[PDB]
Structure formats: C-alpha cells, structure tokens
Amino acid sequence: EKNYVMAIDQGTTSSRAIIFDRNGKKIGSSQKEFPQYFPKSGWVEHNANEIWNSVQSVIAGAFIESGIRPEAIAGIGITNQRETTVVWDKTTGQPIANAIVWQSRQSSPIADQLKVDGHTEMIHEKTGLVIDAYFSATKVRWLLDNIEGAQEKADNGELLFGTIDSWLVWKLTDGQVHVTDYSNASRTMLYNIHKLEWDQEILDLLNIPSSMLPEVKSNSEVYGHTRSYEFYGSEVPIAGMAGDQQAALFGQMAFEKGMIKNTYGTGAFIVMNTGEEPQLSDNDLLTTIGYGINGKVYYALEGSIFVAGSAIQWLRDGLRMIETSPQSEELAAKAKGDNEVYVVPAFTGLGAPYWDSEARGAVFGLTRGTTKEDFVRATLQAVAYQSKDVIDTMKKDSGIDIPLLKVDGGAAKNDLLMQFQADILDIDVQRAANLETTALGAAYLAGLAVGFWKDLDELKSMAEEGQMFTPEMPAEERDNLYEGWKQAVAATQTFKFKA
Amino acid sequence: AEKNYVMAIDQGTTSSRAIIFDRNGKKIGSSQKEFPQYFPKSGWVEHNANEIWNSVQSVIAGAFIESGIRPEAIAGIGITNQRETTVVWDKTTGQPIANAIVWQSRQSSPIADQLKVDGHTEMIHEKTGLVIDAYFSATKVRWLLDNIEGAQEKADNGELLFGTIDSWLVWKLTDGQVHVTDYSNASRTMLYNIHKLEWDQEILDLLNIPSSMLPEVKSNSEVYGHTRSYEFYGSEVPIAGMAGDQQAALFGQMAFEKGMIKNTYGTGAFIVMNTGEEPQLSDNDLLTTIGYGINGKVYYALEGSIFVAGSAIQWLRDGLRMIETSPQSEELAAKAKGDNEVYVVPAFTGLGAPYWDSEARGAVFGLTRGTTKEDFVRATLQAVAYQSKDVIDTMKKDSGIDIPLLKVDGGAAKNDLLMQFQADILDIDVQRAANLETTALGAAYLAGLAVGFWKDLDELKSMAEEGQMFTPEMPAEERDNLYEGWKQAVAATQTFKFKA
Secondary structure, three states: OOOOOEEEEEOEEEEEEEEEEOOEEEEEEEOOOOOOOOOOOOHHHHHHHHHHHOOOHHHHHHHHHHHHHHHHHHEEEEOOOOOOOOEEEEEOOOOOEEOOOOOOOOOHHHHHHHOOOOHHHHHHHHHHHOOOOOOOOOOOHHHHHHHHOHHHHHOOOOEEOOOOHHHHHHHHOOOOOOEEEEHHOOOOOEEEOOOEEEEEEHHHHHHOOHHHHOOOEOOOEEEEEEOOOOOOOOEEEEEEEHHHHHHHHHHHHOOOOEEEEEOOOOEEEEEEOOOOOOOOOOOEEEEEEEEEEEOEEEEEEEEEEEOOOHHHHHHHHOOOOOOOOHHHHHHHHOOOOOOEEEEEOOOEOOOOOOOOOOOOOOOOOOOOOOOOOHHHHHHHHHHHHHHHHHHHHHHHOOOOOOOEEEEEEHHHHHHHHHHHHHHHHOOOOEEEEOOHHHHHHHHHHHHHEEEEEOOOOOOOOHOOOOOOOOOOOOOHHHHHHHHHHHHHHHHHHHHOOOO | OOOOOEEEEEEEEOEEEEEEEEEOOOOOEEEEEEEOOOOOOOOOOEEEEHHHHHHHHHHHHHHHHOOOOHHHHHEEEEEEOOOOEHHHHHEEOOOEEOOOEEEOOOOHHHHHHHHOOOOOOHHHHHHHOOOOOOOOOOHHHHHHHHHOOOOHHHHHHHOOEEEEEHHHHHHHHHOOOOOOOEEEOOOOOOOOOOOOOOOOOOHHHHHOOOOOHOOOEEEEOOEEEEEEEHHHOOOOOEEEEEEEEHHHHHHOOOOOOOOOEEEEOOOEEEEEEEEEEOOOOOOOOOOOEEEEEEOOEEEEEEEEEEOOHHHHHHHHHHHHOOOOOHHHHHHHHHHHOOOOOOOOOOOOOOOOOOOEEEOOOEEEEEEOOOOOOHHHHHHHHHHHHHHHHHHHHHHHHHHOOOOOEEEEEEEHHHHHHHHHHHHHOOOEEEEEEOOHHHHHHEEEEEEHHHOOOOHHHHHHHOOOOOOOOOOOOOHHHHHHHHHHHHHHHHHHHHHOOOOO
C-alpha cells in the first residue's frame, strides 16, 4: 500500500532524505554532513564513497524517524549539487579519485586554454553556458589528465562519468542503471541543449570518450528500481531526477514562463522558467534546461552567485568571528553602523553577471567605528545585493517583468535578510511555506511519474504558500545602498589576480 | 560461505553502539549515537524507550553503512544493555505507558525505604543476592503501577508487559513476538530468585506485580528468535546472545574462572568477580548476582557498584561548566599542582558499595586558597580509583581470596595516568583489555557460541591478546596516606544527613 514518496537531496556540504505524504507534508527527515577536502587554495573535492555513505545514512535516518517502511514508498526522487564530477570503474564501481566539486577552481587552467583557443562562442551556442571550471566538462578533462591510466581506461570503455545524480542512481541500482536527466546533463558543458544530445564536437575537443557517458532521459519517469541498500521489503522505483536548483524551481511551482525564484544555500541561484523557447539573449547569464516532462522540454535563465552561505561559514571557520552560523542574524540585527560598509565575498571570482575569475573577496568603507556586527551584516547583505544585480540583468536580457520573487533555502529563514531583499529589489518576496522546496520538487517529479499525483494540477491544488515580504524602504535609501554596492564591486574588479 | 560476521548491540545509559565483528574478534564496523536524558525532578532519571529503540535502529544502520557489510552476512546478534532500567509497555499497541525509569533514578526510593521499614531486607537478599534500593527494577515497576493511572488495572488484566532494556530490544526486533530476558539481567530486577532460578512469587505478591507482565527467563547464549525483516534492514538474523552490560564485559574479558575479576569504567564503575557455579558463601557489603548461564550451567558473580564515575566528569562539563570537554579533564588533572590533599566524593545519588547509603550526597574536602581547577578535576577523577579499592578490599575480605590482578575496560580506562593511579593505590597489577569495548565483544561471544560461529570456550580463549599492563610504582607511605585521606572524607560525607 504505497502511500509515500521519498526525496534525496545530495547537497554541497550535507545530504538529506525526506519522506513526503500524499499531501506534501514531511513525515520523516534526516540530514548529515560529509567531509570536504581542500588540497590547494581554490580546490574543493569530495569523496564519492562518502557522499554515498551520507545518503544511505539520511535514507535510513528518514525511515527511523517517520516509522514508515520501504514497502510503503511509491517512488524515489533524486536531486543534487550540480556540475560536481565523478569518474568511476565500470566493473569495480570504485571512483578513480576524489570527485571534483562545482566550487573547485582546479580545472580553471584547462578552461582558460579553451577560451584562448576561441571556443567561447561555440560552447555557448551548443550548451548555453560560459567556459569556466564551474561546469563538469573541464573537470572530467582534469581527471583524465592527472590520474595515471585514466585516459587509457576511458578510450577502452572501462570508466564511467557521472554527475552526482548519475552516481547515486548507479549505486541504488547496484550498477544496473547509468542514467542522468536533461537538467543535470545540461550543466556538464558537454550536452547540446538544443539538439538534446551529447555534443560530439565538444567531446572530441576535450578528448572525452563518449563511452563514459550515461543515457540522458527526462526529469520524470522510471529510470529503474532500487536493488537494495536499506530499501528492505521492496524494489522501489527511482522516478525523479534533477539538479537541485531546477528541482527547486519545480517545487516552487514555477511551471510557466517568467515565474522566477531564488534559492539561498551554500551559494545563491536565481532561476527563471523561460518556457519551451531556449531564451533569446542571455548576456551575463546562463541558459540551461529547467526540466523535461510530459514529452516537452522547458528551458531556464539562471543567475549564479557561487558564494552565499559559504561566506557565512567562512566567518565561523575562517575568521572565527562567529560561534555558529545561525549566530549571524543575531549579530547582524544588532548592527549600529551607518550601513556604508560593503563586503564582496568573491572568494573564487565574481559570478553572474560579472563572471570574473580574477576577482577575490574584498571589503570597503571600513572606519574606526566599524564593529563585528557591521561586518557580519555586510557579509549577509551581499547576496541580497548580487541578487538584484542578477534580477536586473534578467529584465534587460528578456524584457520580462519581475513583480514577485519566490524564495527558499536555509538562509531564507532570515526574516531580516528577506525583508532587506524585498526592500533592495523593490518588489515582493514570497518565502516558500516549507524552505526545503528542493527536496519537494524532486518528490513532485517522482510522484507524478508513478501516479502518486495525477498532473501539474493535483499539484497546484496543494499550493499552501505563505510569508510575503513587501517593500517598505524609502527610495532615497534603497538607491544609495545599491549604488554603494555597484561601486564596491567596481573597485573589487580593478584588483586583478590571474595566472 | 557467506555468514561470516557477528553483530553486538550495546544499549548504554547515554548512548548506543553497534559493532560488527569477524571470526577473529576484529572490529569491521562500528557506530555510536547519543539519545535524550530526562530529569523530571532532582534525583529522577528517565529515558524514552522509543527514543532508545531509534538510537538502536540508527547505530545498527550506521554499523552496516560504515563497514560495507550486509545484514545477509551476519551469523548472529548479541544484545547487551544498561541494567535495571525499567520499561512497561502495552501488548497490543507496543507503546510504553510512560518514560522508562533509569537505573540511575532515585524516584522510587520512597517505595524502597518502605520495604526496609517493613523489614524485608533479609528476605529480598536471601532470594536475589541484592540489597533493597531504588537502583533495581522491582521498585521502579511499583512506581509506574502507582503513578500511571489505569496502569495497575491494565496489568491485573494482562495487557502490560515489563522488561529491562534487553527485553525491550528483543521485543522490538522480533516485532512483538519474543518476550524474553536473560539470567544476568533478570537477576538484577530484585524480582528473580537467583538460587531457585525463578521469578519470586512472594516478592511479586508483596509489590502487587502481576506475573502476566514478566518475560521468560532464558540463558545468556542461545537463539531467542529471529529479527523480523522490516526490523533489521533485510534478512531474518538469529538473536543469540544477551547479558547485562557489566556481565557482558566480564565475559569479553574472558573472566571465565572462579576468582577472575574485572572493573569497567563507564557512566559508573562496576567491579565484578566470577565465583563459579556456587554463590559466594559470604557477600557482606556487596551484591551476589548471576554472571552468566551457558552450557546448561549457571555461573555466579560478586559485584560492587559505584554509581557515579563518568557522570562525575559530565557534571564538570554540564553542571559547573568547569571543563569544556570531558576528554579535557585528563589534560587538566595531569597539570595539577596541589598537595593532593583534596578529596571529592561524587555521591550525587548516594554511596554505592561497600557503603550502600542512599542518604549521602556529594561532598568536597581539604580545600585551601591554593586549590585550583586542575586540583578539583584531578580529585574528581581519583574518586573512582579510591572506591574501587574500597570494593576490591571488601572482596578480599568477603572471599578470603587473593587479588594479584585486576582487568579493566570501559571508555575511562583509556586514561593512562588514571589507570596507573588505580594500580599505585590498589598496589596490585592492573591490566587494560587489549580490545577497548569488551562489553560489545562479550555480547558477540555469547551470540557466536550459540550459532556455531565459534566452537567452544577454548577456541574463545585461544585468542587471548593481553593488553596494556600497569604495575604499582607508588611507595607505601604515599599510597597509605592518599587512601587514608579518602576514608576520612567518605566518613565525613556520611555524617552529613540534613533533611527537611
């Protein structure tokens, strides 16, 4: 009697497994952090076996809490941190090395050469992205360049490539299924989002054996069934997959062109549904696939802000300025300063709409009275500021009007930050009823496919949403604050690094 | 072919742990997790049985995940638990009628006192080898049947079952099918006659406890049933080993002969000595209990209970906030500079063996202006070393035997300097188990023996890897004084009995 659905959200620093019920209500949830590795400044890696172990854990943890049994799960929904790359042995199923995370700059040299060789326009035409170490493409090249016997085993058909979603479904199906969905495939920089196929030109260019590639299917259909690993009592269907950000657009019910949301997590990502047309004009932004359902493919415009929650974790672990991350709001709220201190946390370069890899974290406006509180507040408001940069670029590019912004993610818990966001943007901000919209969208994709829910209607029905933030900040203030940011970013960009 | 491992489950006082062992006694998998402690009133200590069940489900899963092994590869499961702790639940629903009362709690003391006032002290001891105190399950079941409205009535009608943690676990694992308990655990209820090997009807009648609530008592090494699929992540594995944690520790140490003795340093300290198939003729200020029942025979033990050991350090960390981390206490005590004339008697819930005084409360003596945090922390750690001597001496006297060696284990036994002190003070050799958590191991052995994973006790002995040894190094003069100070401190502590 399958009356539930489970979503697995494999994020950047922790996992999660939430069991939803027919009404979209949590019945059990479990979360767990897993090891982050930093071999060199700018590098970020994860051990895939450990990601797997953290997923098995939260999976168990969710059953243990809910009191439900695997036999009651109607389908599994899988969403994940995108770009992140894993290359493993087909037969042994052992990763050839650590996985390279979307945050890593270790493959940047590889990507710079592509830019020099003039492949920019060509990659953007085929993939809708920009040439940067952010995407999977260069990461797989890095792995085949720095791991002994890797390239050989690849040409030979012994190694398998796969982003996190592909890796998890592979482990869940004990190697029987090597698949990935449009949304995730589009973020590898090897997928042709227009002809919906792996681009042979790009593979050839990066010398990546197409034998490493998984099959690319839609975001909602049965890819296969669980073999075991804790799903005792049944072979549950794996029926939903998507990059966390796209699954979050879905869980926000941003089904129609123009509906836009923003997720506040490790990084912040603005995603706008642009309907069946792969958006004409996207300078400074990313054109990607939102999701493919009901035989159609819906595209999206994306604004990437790499460092958001990580800036706060830096304050806790790096500068030891704050006891715990949650202590931010409290400290920020106490701020006394004139609010003219700016923090541009471009640790690894400025993302959308700057896309400037030669920039680094900077701070401006510091005086004698500047306090810890002021400094913390500044670090928090940064994402509010860059979000406006991204939203403004979206209007200029698409000419669409943005009257509301649905938001979600851990950081969205901050009422002060969300208010600030509304004030700065001068538009309405509507926080999702439940901030784990990501795992929800994954559950929706899975549910729809197995019959748990009928269609994008018996879904809009449970539109239980609330917590709106309206602009209340005067214009004179709203404009100084943003003008100062624009100037702070400009100065941040004059200080160049590189090579 | 495939069945090549044995899992042991150690459901403790503040955390749970599941370890996966191999035919060689090697730890292949492991996982530990803490669970909520409740303190309704001063002196009271409760646990939510369902939360305990989940910490167990958790560590079981964690142990697999971590080791990469499958449930399909387990030959058997051994269960070891925090003794006395009492749970009363409903047959049909399987819901506890209320929080479980922890062995630590003194909430049923009024009932215990009454029994002493009514003169049952000698009777209870002749039958159970125990002393009347709220420490045991007996009074805890009364308490529950006294305060949970409707409880008595439901029990009188057979809808309620009682059980120490080992019974709760086996019942949950067999999804309400097997309601059992082992000799070692049963003997700690104060409702089980250890000489006749049966629940005592006289005692049951005295506390109006309906026998419909009691589980069958079986040995420590046999198959009590099989785990139900949806209860053990796949496969039906045989649950074949049970013993109270301290007794399990005894077994893992391989203290199989009469006179073999060990001490486990954990939330509390517990000295246990194997006395063979015959109950100790004289057990003056100690407890006569059942160590374990295997191969058709029942082997007895002599125990001296030291209630506050590790929790004394936890109080330093959570009460006085004198330390940032429990492990940080060994750093501080080693940096201690004082004369060592300071004494801490951490009897928060009363003194254990050989004192057995529920009225006494924790006290500190010998404080001067120069006493430092280091001094205090050191004195606090040394308390468990002193009472261990109090107990080991009471055993020398009670049995006339000689005690040249003392095996030790438990988390605290990791503390090298603290073990050296124990040795210096006792003036006898102290040998730390080579395999730190011998409690889990002992549960695995009991289970392995029952499923043929291991032949007999000889094959178990053959793999005896002696661990770290500590021999006395403290001169007679110093040894004598330190210990004499303690006695005088405990004496002083006992003179304090303010009331109302």
